Amino acid sequence: MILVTGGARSGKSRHAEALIGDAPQVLYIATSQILHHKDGRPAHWRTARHLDTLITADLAPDDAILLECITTMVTNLLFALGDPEQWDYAAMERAIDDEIQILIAACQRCPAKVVLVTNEVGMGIVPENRLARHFRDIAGRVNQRLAAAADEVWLVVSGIGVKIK
Amino acid sequence: MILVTGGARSGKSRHAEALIGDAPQVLYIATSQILDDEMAARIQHHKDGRPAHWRTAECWRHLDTLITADLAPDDAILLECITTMVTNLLFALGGENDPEQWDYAAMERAIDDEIQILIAACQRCPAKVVLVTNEVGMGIVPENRLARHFRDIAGRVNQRLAAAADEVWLVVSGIGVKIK
Amino acid sequence: MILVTGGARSGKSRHAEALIGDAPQVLYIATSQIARIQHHKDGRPAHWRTAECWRHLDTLITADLAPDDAILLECITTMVTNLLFALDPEQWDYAAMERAIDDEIQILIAACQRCPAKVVLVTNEVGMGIVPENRLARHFRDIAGRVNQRLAAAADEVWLVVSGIGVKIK
Ligand SMILES: Nc1nc2c(ncn2[C@@H]2O[C@H](COP(=O)(O)O)[C@@H](O)[C@H]2O)c(=O)[nH]1
Ligand SMILES: Nc1nc2c(ncn2[C@@H]2O[C@H](COP(=O)(O)O)[C@@H](O)[C@H]2O)c(=O)[nH]1
Ligand SMILES: [Mg+2]
């Protein structure tokens, strides 16, 4: 696949989409749990966890999948895997890794264009909040995995896509 | 124009300044409001290094009044910085109401207006125009309501500016990176 | 010398270790003040000795050091932190603190100027987030950046590492 990263309000979405282009058929994997976009989304696009079920081997090369976003997906999983003070951050990481490996696998075998969106969350200062701190570590480790797995990697800054790989 | 971004103490000020260089007449546009002796004391070093052929203005509204169309193509303008301006606008807007009770949707809409104007100005200005902004969203989601919103807002302003820019540079550890 | 920067868990360390290579003899300078560490060691080669210090690096970064040998410093930000703490965080004279910090930076810098061995320093990007409410953190974050510029300016090669991907900026 293709991995797009960047800070909040970096324009990574727009860049991802720009990566999608027309693209005949487009599957949007919208990971946030609901605790304006759905409107700007072309009517043609479909909107959809249990991700490997979507990222299939029997798709078209002209087809395209957009997952938004990896971070969120990470978050949902911890909680799912889970109060965060009794948490064994270590075990959590591993499990998370399993999952990511699964995504990778799926993406690996998927004939469609796959574009994954994630965020850079650790160019800031060490947070005081443990989960927060934990969180940031795991997310970075997840990104490395994806990146390594990725074919192309972009970093978006101020809406400017920078192809790092 | 040229857009220059980086985190705090990235060296973007100095890189910006380098972008301008030897220009005969320079106008430094300074958007900070000194709300402390600390904030004031530091602006000091800024001035202290400022040149004689550089005029300062202590402004952050209507730069359209500053970034002008009769300007000489050999002259330059350095605006420092977007983020402050944005922060300046945000509390203006906010008024004597708590940030809590703020209408970020509104504010952001009002914010875009002033940005649009700025872009137009920069677009119609024959002089070299450099703007300094900050990268503030490479970290963890902010607990504090505003902050969280200000971060969104900043990012959006950034995109626009960048979009508009003829040139963009990311400066890391004092190292300028031309991304556009 | 080589400066490698990036954020927390950006794969900068791996990248760093990668610049080191099959460096026969390597000195690992761990600035962290003390389990998490237990393992770092654990995954550290045999022909690599470790020096736990964040002061007088000039004591380790020597002129006699063999070219084909290397130094891996990890990490600058930490060092910084300890430094500040060396010098109540509210009643701190930041301007002064910072100057001392730079004194130590200059040492480090001159040291790497005459060390014939490969010197790699690892630091982090920490000013790409929002302005902190905490006054130390604000200053820390401020000192941290100035320190990076100096090093970067001193370094021969500068790499920004993103999501495990290395970007050569200098
Ligand atoms: N009000 C005001 N702010 C200034 C002046 N010179 C620089 N600044 C502010 O100083 C900022 C940069 O901070 P500095 O470069 O310490 O660390 C810019 O955001 C700019 O608005 C000046 O003469 N007046
Ligand atoms: N004190 C100390 N810190 C170490 C040692 N080995 C690695 N580190 C520290 O580990 C830090 C990175 O943390 P980590 O990724 O292992 O949890 C580096 O900043 C470095 O100072 C060691 O033997 N002693
Ligand atoms: Mg997005």
Q: Looking at the complex, does the CB of residue B140 fall below 8 Å from at least one CB of chain A?
A: yes
Which residues 6+ apart lie within 8 Å of A50 measured at CB? Answer: none
Ligand 2 pocket test target in C5, C10, C26, C32 with most atoms within 8 Å of CB? C32
Q: Which residues pair with A29 in a beta bridge?
A: A67
For residues C114 and C64, give the distance between their C-alpha atoms in angstroms, rounded to a whole number: 9
Residue ranges of the alpha helices (H) in A21-151? Answer: 37-40, 70-81, 89-109, 130-149
For residues C155 and C105, give the distance between their C-alpha atoms in angstroms, rounded to a whole number: 12
Residue B138: Cβ-neighbour burial (10 angstroms; 0-12, 13-18, 19+) = buried
For residues A77 and A71, give the distance between their C-alpha atoms in angstroms, rounded to a whole number: 10
For residues A1 and C152, give the distance between their C-alpha atoms in angstroms, rounded to a whole number: 34
Taking the C-alpha atoms of B73, B77, B78 and B84 in order, what is their torsion angle to the nearest 10 degrees? -140
Structure tokens at C102: 């730079």
Question: Is 3.40.50.300 the CATH classification of the domain at A1-165?
Answer: yes
Inter-chain Cβ pairs, chain A and chain B, closer than 8 A? 73
Tell whether ligand 1 has an atom less than 6 A from the beta carbon of residue B31.
yes
Inter-axis angle of helices B82-94 and B104-124, nearest 10: 140
Count of C-beta atoms within a 10 Å radius of residue A19? 18
Asked if C7's CB is within 8 angstroms of A140's CB, the reply is yes
Instruction: Please check whether residue B4 is in contact with residue B166, taking contact to mean a CB–CB distance below 8 angstroms.
Output: no
Instruction: Please check whether residue B145 is in contact with residue B101, taking contact to mean a CB–CB distance below 8 angstroms.
Output: no
The closest of C84, C151, C7 to B11, measured between CA atoms, is C151
Q: At residue C70, what are phi and psi to the nearest 5 degrees?
A: -140, 165
Secondary structure element (H or E) that encloses residue A30, with its range: strand A26-30
For tokens 């605006």, name the residue.
B79
Q: Which residues of B touch A123 (CB under 8 A)?
A: 7, 135, 138-139
Strands A113-117 and A160-163, how do they pair? unpaired
Amino acid at A106: A
Tell me which of 2.40.70.10, 3.40.718.10, 3.40.50.300, 3.30.460.10 is the CATH number of domain C1-170.
3.40.50.300
For residues B134 and B172, give the distance between their C-alpha atoms in angstroms, rounded to a whole number: 11
The residue in chain A having the minimum alpha-carbon distance to the alpha carbon of residue C167 is A164
Asked if A153's CB is within 8 angstroms of C128's CB, the reply is no
Asked if C132's CB is within 8 angstroms of A153's CB, the reply is no
Positions of E strands within B7-156 = 26-30, 54-58, 76-80, 128-134
B100-108, long-range: CB within 8 Å, 24+ apart, which pairs? B100/B145, B102/B146, B102/B149, B104/B149, B104/B153, B107/B153, B108/B152, B108/B153, B108/B156
Which residues 6+ apart lie within 8 Å of C50 measured at CB? Answer: C27, C28, C29, C30, C41, C44
Amino acid at B130: V
How many Å is the Cα radius of gyration of chain B? 16
Instruction: Please check whether residue C144 is in contact with residue C80, taking contact to mean a CB–CB distance below 8 angstroms.
Output: yes
Name the minimum distance, in Å, from the CA of A146 to any CA of chain C. 8
- The shortest CB-CB distance from C141 to any of B8, B137, B147 is to B8
Structure tokens at B171: 């400066």
User: In this structure, which topology does domain B1-180 adopt according to CATH?
Assistant: Rossmann fold (3.40.50)
For residues B2 and B168, give the distance between their C-alpha atoms in angstroms, rounded to a whole number: 6
Tell whether ligand 1 has an atom less than 6 A from the beta carbon of residue B47.
yes
Which residues 6+ apart lie within 8 Å of B51 measured at CB? Answer: B26
The residue in chain B having the minimum alpha-carbon distance to the alpha carbon of residue C146 is B9
Strands C26-30 and C48-51, how do they pair? parallel
How many Å is the Cα radius of gyration of chain C? 16
Active site residue B15: no
The closest of C86, C151, C92 to C124, measured between CA atoms, is C151
Sheet holding A26-30, edge to edge: A46-47, A26-30, A64-68, A113-117, A2-6, A152-157, A160-163
- CA–centroid distance, B50 to ligand 1, in Å, is 11
Which residues 6+ apart lie within 8 Å of A126 measured at CB? Answer: A133, C8
Amino acid at C30: A
Which residues 6+ apart lie within 8 Å of B162 measured at CB? Answer: A158, A159, A160, B3, B5, B168, B180
Q: Looking at the complex, does the CB of residue B141 fall below 8 Å from at least one CB of chain C?
A: no
Q: Looking at the complex, does the CB of residue C132 fall below 8 Å from at least one CB of chain A?
A: yes
Amino acid at B43: I
Which residues 6+ apart lie within 8 Å of C132 measured at CB? Answer: A125, C138, C141
Name the minimum distance, in Å, from the CA of B29 to any CA of chain C. 22
Q: From the candidates C15, C40, C47, C139, give the one annotated as an active-site residue.
A: C40
Q: Looking at the complex, does the CB of residue B175 fall below 8 Å from at least one CB of chain C?
A: yes
Instruction: Please check whether residue C134 is in contact with residue C85, taking contact to mean a CB–CB distance below 8 angstroms.
Output: no
3-class SS shares of chain C: helix, strand, coil, % to 5: 40, 20, 40
Amino acid at C23: A
Omega before residue B122 within 30° of 0, cis: no
Asked if B175's CB is within 8 angstroms of C158's CB, the reply is yes
Q: At what resolution in Å was this solved? A: 2.2
